[PDB]
Amino acid sequence: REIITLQLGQCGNQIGFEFWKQLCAEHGISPEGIVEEFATDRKDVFFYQADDEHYIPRAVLLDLEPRVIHSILNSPYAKLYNPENIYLGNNWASGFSQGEKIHEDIFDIIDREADGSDSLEGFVLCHSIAGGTGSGLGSYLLERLNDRYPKKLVQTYSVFPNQDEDVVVQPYNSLLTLKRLTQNADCVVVLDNTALNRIATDRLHIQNPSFSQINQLVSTIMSASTTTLRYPGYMNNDLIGLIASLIPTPRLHFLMTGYTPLTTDKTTVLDVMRRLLQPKNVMVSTNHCYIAILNIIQGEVDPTQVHKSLQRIRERKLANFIPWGPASIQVALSRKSPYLPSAHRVSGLMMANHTSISSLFERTCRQYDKLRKREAFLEQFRKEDMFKDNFDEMDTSREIVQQLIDEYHAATRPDYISWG
Amino acid sequence: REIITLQLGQCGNQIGFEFWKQLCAEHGISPEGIVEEFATDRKDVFFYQADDEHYIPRAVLLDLEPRVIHSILNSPYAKLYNPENIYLGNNWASGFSQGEKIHEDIFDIIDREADGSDSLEGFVLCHSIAGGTGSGLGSYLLERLNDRYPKKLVQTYSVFPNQDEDVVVQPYNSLLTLKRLTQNADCVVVLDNTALNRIATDRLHIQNPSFSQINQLVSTIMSASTTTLRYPGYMNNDLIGLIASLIPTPRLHFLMTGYTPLTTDKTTVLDVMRRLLQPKNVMVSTNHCYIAILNIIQGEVDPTQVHKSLQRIRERKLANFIPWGPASIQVALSRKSPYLPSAHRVSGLMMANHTSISSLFERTCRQYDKLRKREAFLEQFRKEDMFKDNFDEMDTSREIVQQLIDEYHAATRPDYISWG
Amino acid sequence: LECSWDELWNKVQQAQDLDHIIAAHEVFLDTIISRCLLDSDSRALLNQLRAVFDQIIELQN
Structure with missing residues (x-):
């Protein structure tokens, strides 16, 4: 069944824009969505089809306080991505509250695409953790989708921000996002800004x-x-x-x-x-x-x-793992596409469930705990305080994410058969 | 018998212009009306036959306060549409009153074509609901044609305006047009501007x-x-x-x-x-x-x-209906034309009687009811007040359209065998 | 009158013998007699159909 990608926030829209451009070049698609003359692939799932093989992706671009979405519009590929589904603060609470008032119209945008497709498997969110406008709104939308589509699944390509630690309320915002993601997201693929920046220094001289x-x-x-x-x-x-x-x-x-x-x-x-x-x-x-x-x-x-x-x-044993899980590594194969360079003819990727990421979650939880004792940045604006007078959802998130950390280390333990 | 299209108003003339151009390209006709050299179709009904293969359509183009009709004239197809049948406010009352004084000579323009044709079945109006000049005049002309041709039928390709709600007297205008159309129009095919932007969402880069x-x-x-x-x-x-x-x-x-x-x-x-x-x-x-x-x-x-x-x-049951009417869904076939692109060579359309359109009628009746209680925009012009001092044609239209709404819901209930 | 027409059109356009063209026209005509109710066995059904058209002209009056 076809997949719909819910790209939201400035950063999320940037990475969804680039992803769809990448699949334009990779697939037989021109910048106007026209089937390329030079052009064996299952384009049904990701791109809506015309019989001339015009292929508009099922992208939902959500803008809030738009700045970079105007640049997205002024691009050669604006004709490529047109489901005509773009509908007009740096705090999680501000983003959540701003999302609440426009939830019906963006959800009607969701409904239209769901009806248009022959069928629907998944919602893939190009979400930004602690992304100002992106976070809060993404958490609220994540809470709405599972309720409206209980059978369906949500994946989140979360770009978890680590920039060596500007936004002062990052741990607060991220802590809330992880609570919503831990209980209301079927899958998450985590990425790290410091990790990719370190790779950038490795492969290139790009730093700034x-x-x-x-x-x-x-x-x-x-x-x-x-x-x-x-x-x-x-x-x-x-x-x-x-x-x-x-x-x-x-x-x-x-x-x-x-x-x-x-x-x-x-x-x-x-x-x-x-x-x-x-x-x-x-x-x-x-x-x-x-x-x-x-x-x-x-x-x-x-x-x-x-x-x-x-x-x-297996003889090398480069990967060491003795989890409760019996899952063994598997070698899978996919097709390298034509028309693009075949440099490094053989090229691979891995997806894995690793306990190390508990450390990264605990780092932002540590920053949050220190900031929480100080109460240096409680925010408590008119928006923040009125939306959360108790400020107790923060503690609810703290206990939920602490359960997650404990669960990770319990998975490391030999006895995850018992409750984790 | 041949069909005559009474396209009127600026918007109606725009869509009639484009329709006749579309059938020029589709049929074997050049922009000067000449039979195309490159060219199995029944062109008798829609195109009058000249001696030297000038296929001139039976278009009656009515202009009031002309602006876009001059643009229609300075076109390559002006020679295509030459019956030489053009004869020179934003209120329904202004349009109706302006039509009344010219009613005889435009009706002689109808009479001439009616005589010139071998025979006549139908008057197809490219009518604009609440179209300023288009409405009012179209309602008056609709009232005249049925009296003059009691046997003959009138169809209306009404572009019902929904633009998310500028014309501030739009509910009043549309209200009166619907009374005249409900009691004096043999058929209506309803079209919607918001629905047309919404049907345009995914198909072409025509958002703005x-x-x-x-x-x-x-x-x-x-x-x-x-x-x-x-x-x-x-x-x-x-x-x-x-x-x-x-x-x-x-x-x-x-x-x-x-x-x-x-x-x-x-x-x-x-x-x-x-x-x-x-x-x-x-x-x-x-x-x-x-x-x-x-x-x-x-x-x-x-x-x-x-x-x-x-x-x-029938097994899918994608269309749910349990009306009083026994008419089941039916498959019909027509011929795809040559010389034009056959992209997606199979291609279909549906015309249906649906009770949902009662909602769209009731939305403009809601706007009218609210505006009527406020009396903010009675217009109170001397044209408006003198032509309707009582302002009771608005109330007559309100009760007639309310009868129509109740009749739609009567069709919904199981007992439309009784009076609706 | 369209499925049988397609069937005939295939069985003629492939065939390269007039003795088969004849025998394809034959089966087209016979198959239309059976898909219509004009056969010698569907006489009762045809009479019923005529008796449903009778009520239409009655309504006309």
């Missing part, structure tokens, strides 16, 4: 324009994470089928990313897997262990060697 | 210039609704024969439209029917139910598949 270039890194991860759906293959021909292995327990649904040729601008599968398990490739910044690992390879891959590659990588 | 680019939408619908007449087929070889199914009771003669490939720029008949019944393909913005549905498919449709589609649609 981090955000503009890191968009490309995020877009490559996003496209590669869906390529197995976008192109037919033997297995994982549907999102839920892929998601099941990656998320073994509902609470621990946050996923790690990695990409073998970070400098993708011949290598055997043994090499790409071994490279992939190394930490410099990992794009995320007491014993600790993975819960489950999965890897997808797109290129000139010889088929007899992929089992032998998994066997060798 | 919608009203400018909704002309093409209206033109496609108008052409497709007549294609079964303009091209020979086994059934519905006459306007009245088609109309009979669509309007089962005289009062409820307002028809909803829909078009399967909104992005018409292979699909089986099963697919086009199921798509068409969905609300996105629909272009109109307590139980509610259709009274009767009809669909025409123009394309290379396989014949042992149309009946598959009919009963498959």
Whole structure:
């Protein structure tokens, strides 16, 4: 069933814009949405179809206090993305309250697309954690979608902000977003600003324009994470089928990313897997262990060697994990597309459930706890205080995210069979 | 018998201009009316035959306070439309009064064409509801034609204005037009501006210039609704024969439209029917139910598949209706024309009697009722007050349209066998 | 009168013998007699259909 992408907030709209442009170039699509003359792929799921093979994506672009959405409109690809579904503070509470008043019209925008599609599997949110306008509104919309579509699933490509720690209310905002995400999101794929910036310093000399270039890194991860759906293959021909292995327990649904040729601008599968398990490739910044690992390879891959590659990588034991989970790593394959450069002919990505990210959650919880004792930035404006006089949803989020941290470490423990 | 189109008002003349241009391109006609050299169609009804193959349509273009009719004149197709039949306020009363003084010579323009044609079935009005000059004059002319031609029928391609609610006397104007149309119009095909921007959402990059680019939408619908007449087929070889199914009771003669490939720029008949019944393909913005549905498919449709589609649609039950009327949904076919692009060579439209349009009527009656209690905008001009001192034609229209609303809901209840 | 027409049109346009063109026209005509109610067995059904048209002309008066 077709997937609808709910890109919201300035940062979320930037990364959704780049992702859809990336899939325009990758697929047989021109900047006006026209089927390319030069042009074997399952474009049904992500792009709505005309018989001349015009392909407008099912993007929902939500703008609040718009600045960069005007730049999105003044682009060559404005004709490409036209579901005509753009409807007009830096605080989570301000974003939540601003979302509440316009919830019906944006949800009617959702309903129109849901009706238009033959059918609907999933809502993929290009969400921004502690994203000012993006956060709060994304949390409220996340709470609305599950209630309205209980059977359906929500994924969140959360760009978790770590910038070495400007917004002073970041821990507060992020803490609230994680409560809503922990109880009201089926899946989350986490990315890190410091991790991608460190990769940027590694591969290039770019330091100052981090955000503009890191968009490309995020877009490559996003496209590669869906390529197995976008192109037919033997297995994982549907999102839920892929998601099941990656998320073994509902609470621990946050996923790690990695990409073998970070400098993708011949290598055997043994090499790409071994490279992939190394930490410099990992794009995320007491014993600790993975819960489950999965890897997808797109290129000139010889088929007899992929089992032998998994066997060798087992001998290497580069990835150490003794979780409660029995999930073993699996070598999966997808189709490298034509018309784009085939540099580094074999190129792979991994999605994994790893307990290390509990550390990153605990870092923002630590910042929040310190800030909370100080009460240096309680916000308590007319908006903040009136919306939250008790300020007790913050403590509710603190206990929920603390449950999540404890659950992660319990998953590390041998006895997650018992309650975590 | 030949059909004459009484296009009036600025907006009505715009859509009649575009409709006749659309049928010029579709039929074997050049911009000077000459038979095209490159050129199996029944052009008798819509195009008068000149001796030297000037296919001049039977268009009666009525201008009042002309601005856009001069632009219509300075066009390449001015020679195409040359019956030489053009004869020179924003209030319904102003339009009606201005029409009254010119009523004889415009009626002589009708008489001349009626005599010139071999014979005459129908008057098709490109009418604009609450169109300033268009409304009032169209209502008066509608009242004159039925008296002068009691046997003959009047259809109205009413572009009912919904623009999210500038014309501040719009509810009053639309109210009076609906009284005249309910009691003095044989058929009405309802069109909506907000629904037309909403049908334009996903199909073309026409978000901001919608009203400018909704002309093409209206033109496609108008052409497709007549294609079964303009091209020979086994059934519905006459306007009245088609109309009979669509309007089962005289009062409820307002028809909803829909078009399967909104992005018409292979699909089986099963697919086009199921798509068409969905609300996105629909272009109109307590139980509610259709009274009767009809669909025409123009394309290379396989014949042992149309009946598959009919009963498959019966199993799907995508269209829910339990009216008093016994008329079931029916599959009809027409001929896709040559020389034009056959992209999505199968392509379909639907005309249906739906009770939902009562809601759209009741919205303008709500606006009128509120405005009427306030008496903010009675206009109080000397034209308005002198022409209606009592202001009781507004109340007569209110009770007549309220009867229409009650009759629609009467059609909904199981006992429309009794008086409605 | 359209499925049988397609069927005939295929069985003629592929065929390269007039003895088969004849025998395709034959089965088209016979199949229209059966899809219509003009057969020698559907006489009762045809009479009923005529008796439903009788009420239409009665209503006309």
